[PDB]
Design a protein around this nucleic acid. Structure first.
Lengths: 114, 122
RNA sequence: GGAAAGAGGAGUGGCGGACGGGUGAGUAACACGUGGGUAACCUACCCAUCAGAGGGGGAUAACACUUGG
RNA sequence: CACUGGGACUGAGACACGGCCCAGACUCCUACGGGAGGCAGCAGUAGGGAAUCUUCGGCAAUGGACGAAAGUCUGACCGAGC
RNA sequence: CUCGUUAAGGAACUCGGCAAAAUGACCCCGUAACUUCGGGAGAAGGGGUGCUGACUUCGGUCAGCCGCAGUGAAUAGGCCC
RNA sequence: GGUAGCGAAAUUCCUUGUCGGGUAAGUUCCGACCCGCACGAAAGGCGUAACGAUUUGGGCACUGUCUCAACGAGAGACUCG
RNA sequence: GCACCUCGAUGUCGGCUCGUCGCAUCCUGGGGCUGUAGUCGGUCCCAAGGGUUGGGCUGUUCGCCCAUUAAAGCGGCACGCGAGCUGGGUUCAGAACGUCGUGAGACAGUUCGGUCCCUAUCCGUCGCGGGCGUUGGAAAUUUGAGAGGAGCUGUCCUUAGUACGAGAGGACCGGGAUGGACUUACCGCUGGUGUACCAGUUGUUCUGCCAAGGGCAUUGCUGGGUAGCUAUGUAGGGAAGGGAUAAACGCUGAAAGCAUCUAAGUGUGAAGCCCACCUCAAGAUGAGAUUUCCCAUUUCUUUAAGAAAGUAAGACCCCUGAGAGAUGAUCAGGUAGAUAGGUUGGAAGUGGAAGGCUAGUGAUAGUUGGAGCGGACCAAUACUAAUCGGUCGAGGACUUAAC
């Protein structure tokens, strides 16, 4: 463990804001359309986070044009530029897998100040 | 992954609603299809009126699966549905409207007429 | 550079855009025709009459500079 | 009644014929992130049909909007063409 | 051998859906062809169900609270042509 | 010298008869046709609601039946008396 | 066709699982002829390395059909395989139809139903140990006689819209990119599981009661999940070459003044053959090689490759174990100590403990506080257990030659 952490230490990002599963987030991804570079945005609710080290990932749920979409990211990629927390949610567990079988108003998460 | 006798919704304006897969073209014993793969299928449910009528053998390309795709930078995408678009043997939609959102892998496989009409391209 | 007129430009504000012009798809009913009722009603511009028109405050477009397109 | 279907806002008066917002089908421009439109006004076009006209001139006259007024606007309308 | 769970697909298995899985309680709404008029009928298809307070005419209804889930365990029709 | 009714049938050899239906594809199934090897009226003919741990064909739901296998619990198996 | 063989018993077809062999070759490789312009083809010769698909209908082979593929080969092996599976079909006892028979009954006509036993002795096949040998006793590193695995193939881009051809159409020979099926490892990612991990919740019973908990109900049920084992996940592979050949094609050349690949001489030439790549291997009784370590008591049968005794180098018994495992073996350690348990910090994971406080009539909510708990994972630490001991294990033959 400590030989691996030392090698991988110099590649962890330091500008990562704190968030939990349940919060809403805007990810500033990076797309390459031929030679062009460009930035998209992907707005949704964080539903997963499974971790320990450079190997940390999270996933975001969204509903686009009547179909639900999920996108998982590593925490430390340089191919993301920004993670912004928009709201805070009141939640009671770590994996919000029950959201993937609800729609509209049943899938509502209450807000909370922090 | 989509195999023989899987059923797909249609994300097109062609007159078909449900489709049943018959073959997974390309190879000699290949099992499954993915996003950007071509297929031979039966129309199982049509719409009253429409260029395409029920009982027909036709070709379609997969967008939008549940077990989705993986990108080179370590990130993934997954959908809640399986869907396809009926195709005209040189990759053009036989309809004029695509519904719902579409995976970005259809660019690399060169369905450029379809990436023009999709509402969102993820 | 101090000059007063004539001719342009966008802006704030008033009034008009519910008229005039088109068509007959819907509609078997107070929709229309004819005869009445409202002690259950509204009405800018126009005409008449009576009475007012006091004294204060905080802004904003334009304009000038600047960001993303 | 105003491309099909819902809604309100401003206003004395509209749930509005060349206004706004949302949904739907159709058409169009895009650097893909997005944007634009509604002749059942007058001419005109393609299509359907046995079958039905000019992409004209002027506000001199009568009526209408605004302005104190000169005036500016008016495919209403007055004339010309087949 | 006897049990529990399983990504994506969902009878492509096999002589044959064999074996499994699924339905299952109570209250309310509804329910076709046909018929010997009794039936068919639990046809099919849908909704409610926990806890606290107030009122309760009576049987219940309103206000509020919590979880992924309220016949929160065990026991209990799959259906159609 | 076989009438009504029915007929590739629990009966039809040739035969997977021919035509329509259902499937992407149907020697099984359903509808019809009549050329009934070898139907036929109480060893009854032809219908028929209700019923069946009967026989057959098709749909929805559900699934380790299958693509194609993986993990876990217990009993035998394995070592010692 | 015959009746040698088996009647004190030799169990039929399709399917399943697992294959192997022949070549009269289905694809891929190499060629000669063409009534071969190019693109596609016809036919004959050489070639068995590898490859050769999923459904529908029938008990069905056979067959027809659908959608693909480079291709969807044909035979042998008790028409391979039931002490390995199935029992749909044929061929027991029940019942029915057509038909024959006076009848009892019958039909390679049909229909619905219908019991498949076996604890592996020997050889054989896959794995794993003990004994001795290899001529002093030991600890390691190895060569390779032999042997096994592997061996498939598509599409696009370029050469080039070039050669060819009226047009339509469209190459060889080279170079580059990316796939299908098959296969060797592995758990960082995406998922599965995860019965001594965390949480929620129903019924009833116990810890005297309240609060807080234990037992049982499939782990009572429901939502997550560490290590480990895993595919549908991730990485790699069948790369390029050399040698001798098959069909075929020569160069030089006479017998036979010419001609002729052949007799003497001399070449080219295939996915095939021997190497090249991977793994096993000196029980290869032909038992191979290199480096390092250790060096002499007592009586005599008679002196002899003699017996017996204590030892060296080294090894084992016994104990703590896991990266190993049915057992045994293998590997990590035994106080010259981190081998396993515990302790002290941490992590994954769960998701806000108990006891108080505050706001509510209450159910509950907020706060102290990313709290409490935490199997297998990571560091440190001799606190407990690896104590004390015993057993086995050399003294190196003879002949010839060179030094």
């Amino acid at each position: 463990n400590p030989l691996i952490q030392e090698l991988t230490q110099e590649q962890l990002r330091t500008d990562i804001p704190a968030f939990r599963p349940g919060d809403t987030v805007r990810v500033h991804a990076k797309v390459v359309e031929g030679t062009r570079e460009r930035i998209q945005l992907f707005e949704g609710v964080v539903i997963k986070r499974r971790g320990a080290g450079i190997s940390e990932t999270y996933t975001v749920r969204k509903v686009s044009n009547g179909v639900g979409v999920e996108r998982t990211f590593p925490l430390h990629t340089p191919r993301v530029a920004q993670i912004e927390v928009v709201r805070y949610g009141k939640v009671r567990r770590a994996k919000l897998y029950y959201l993937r079988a609800l729609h509209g108003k049943a899938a509502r998460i209450k807000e909370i100040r922090r | 992954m989509i195999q023989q006798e899987s059923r797909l919704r249609v994300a097109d304006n062609s007159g078909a609603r449900e489709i049943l897969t018959i073959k997974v073209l390309g190879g000699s014993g290949r099992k499954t299809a993915n996003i950007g793969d071509v297929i031979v299928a039966t129309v199982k449910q049509a719409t009253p009126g429409g260029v395409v009528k029920k009982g027909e053998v036709v070709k379609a390309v997969i967008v939008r699966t549940k077990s989705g795709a993986r990108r080179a930078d370590g990130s993934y995408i997954k959908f809640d549905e399986n869907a396809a678009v009926i195709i005209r043997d040189d990759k053009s939609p036989r309809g004029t409207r695509i519904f719902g959102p579409v995976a970005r892998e259809l660019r690399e496989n060169n369905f450029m007429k379809i990436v023009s009409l999709a509402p969102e391209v993820l």
